[PDB]
């Protein structure tokens, strides 16, 4: 299989190197020369423009920063692709944007999936990413051997846009949970309940969740958690803030009532003005700001 990989950033570059390593011919494009060079060093043939990269591809993967860039990339390459090329957008963009680009691609006789990922750069490099896929089951079947070498998990979430929707919904819950856990540790401390005691209880009770059992925002109970390493990401506040912005778009587009997710979004937006580079669990230290 020949794959065109459009977007060779911090996620795209390690993903594309895993495809090289699984025996695919990978053609690439990125507007940053350093990204492009790095990718060429691990075997991607890099082209000066995206339509050139796409020209001989059986599969086109995009990993790009916004829906607007993804849409422009599609309109800039679709005429250059061969018929029934499989497009896979692994960017995290709105559900609306995803559905729009899916329909665009399919009106060209392409096959298209949304397949955004969780796991970050670390997962990208380790080939453990979780792909949450929207689109046709038979198209996912076709894509599977491409996704496998990048992936620890591949979940079909439903029709086009369901992958984006599933990720944004999970991440909105996660943000709420990370703040809630932080509130609980600070309350405990003021009540004279040790961090280890609270951790032992919550993890054995109804309140347990990854935000505590793995991302514990106080040092000690989980030695590997960011709190023990100066809140080095992990999962940055910048990225969490980005996902919550997409959750707020989805809430506005649907008229949904999401009082705690929206509150969480306000909290992280504000925290990202100061500490975008720290793991999102570091929110525990911004609660006195309100």
Ligand X SMILES: C[C@@H](CCC(=O)O)C(=O)O
Q: Which is nearer to ligand X, 99 or 167 (CB)?
A: 167
Q: Return contacts of 150-155, CB within 8 angstroms, 24+ apart.
A: 150/15, 150/18, 150/19, 150/124, 151/127, 152/119, 152/123, 152/126, 152/127, 152/128, 153/128, 153/129, 154/130, 155/130, 155/131
Position 142 contacts ligand X (CB under 6 A): no
* Residues 146 and 88: beta-carbon distance below 8 Å: yes
Q: Which is nearer to ligand X, 117 or 227 (CB)?
A: 117
Query: Is 132 part of any known ligand binding site?
Result: no
Active site residue 167: yes
Token pair recorded at residue 120: 């970050």
Q: From the CB of 287, what's the least distance to a second copy, in Å?
A: 4
Torsion sign, CA atoms 39, 1, 99, 158: negative
Q: Does a cis peptide bond (omega within 30 degrees of 0) precede residue 234? A: yes
**Partner touching 151 among a second copy, ligand X, none, CB below 5 to 8 Å by kind:** ligand X
* Residue 48 within binding range of a second copy, rule CB under 8 A: no
11 known member of a binding site? yes
Catalytic pick from 167, 190, 232, 270? Answer: 167
Minimum Å gap between C-beta 155 and ligand X is 8
Copy the structure tokens of residue 157. 């979430």
CA-CA-CA-CA dihedral for 269, 222, 173, 289, to nearest 10? -30
Question: Is there binding between residue 257 and a second copy (CB under 8 A)?
Answer: yes
CB 134 within 8 A of CB 97: no
Binding flag, residue 250, a second copy (CB under 8 A): yes
- How far is residue 140's CA from residue 238's CA, in Å, rounded to a whole number? 31
By CB under 8 A, residue 187 contacts a second copy:
yes
CB of 81 to a second copy, least distance (A): 27
Task: Please state, in angstroms and rounded to a whole number, the distance separating the CA atoms of residues 53 and 104.
Answer: 19
Applying CB under 8 A, does 286 fall inside the site for a second copy? Answer: yes
Instruction: Write out the catalytic residue numbers.
Output: 167
Q: Which residues bind ligand X (CB under 6 A)?
A: 127, 148-149, 151-154
Q: Which residues bind a second copy (CB under 8 A)?
A: 95, 118, 130, 132, 153, 155-159, 161-162, 165-167, 169-174, 176-177, 179-181, 183-184, 186-188, 190-194, 197-198, 200-202, 204-211, 247, 250-251, 254-261, 263-264, 267, 286-290
């Amino acid at each position: 299989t020949t794959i065109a990989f459009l977007g060779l950033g911090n996620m795209g570059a390690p993903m594309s190197a895993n495809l090289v390593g699984a025996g695919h011919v990978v053609r690439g494009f990125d507007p940053a020369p350093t990204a492009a060079s790095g990718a060429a060093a691990h075997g991607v043939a890099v082209f000066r423009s995206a339509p050139e990269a796409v020209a001989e591809a059986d599969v086109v993967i995009t990993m790009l920063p916004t829906g607007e860039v993804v849409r422009r990339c599609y309109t800039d390459v679709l005429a250059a692709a061969r018929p029934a090329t499989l497009f896979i957008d692994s960017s995290t963009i709105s559900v609306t944007d995803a559905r729009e680009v899916h329909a665009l691609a399919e009106s060209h006789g392409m096959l298209q999936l949304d397949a955004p990922v969780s796991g970050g750069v670390k997962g990208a490099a380790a080939a453990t990413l979780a792909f949450m896929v929207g689109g046709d089951e038979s198209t996912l079947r076709r894509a599977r051997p491409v996704l496998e070498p990048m992936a620890g998990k591949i979940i079909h979430c439903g029709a086009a846009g369901a992958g984006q929707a599933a990720k944004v919904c999970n991440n909105m819950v996660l943000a709420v949970q990370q703040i809630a856990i932080a509130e609980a540790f600070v309350l405990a401390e003021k009540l004279g309940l040790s961090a280890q005691s609270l951790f032992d209880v919550i993890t054995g009770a109804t309140g347990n969740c990854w935000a505590v059992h793995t991302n514990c925002p106080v040092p000690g109970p989980v030695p590997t958690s960011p709190a023990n390493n100066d809140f080095k990401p992990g999962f940055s506040t910048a990225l969490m803030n980005k996902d919550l912005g997409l959750a707020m778009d989805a809430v506005a587009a649907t008229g949904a009532t999401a009082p705690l997710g929206s509150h969480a979004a306000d909290i992280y937006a504000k925290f990202a003005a100061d500490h975008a580079d720290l793991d999102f669990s570091a929110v525990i230290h911004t609660l006195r700001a309100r």
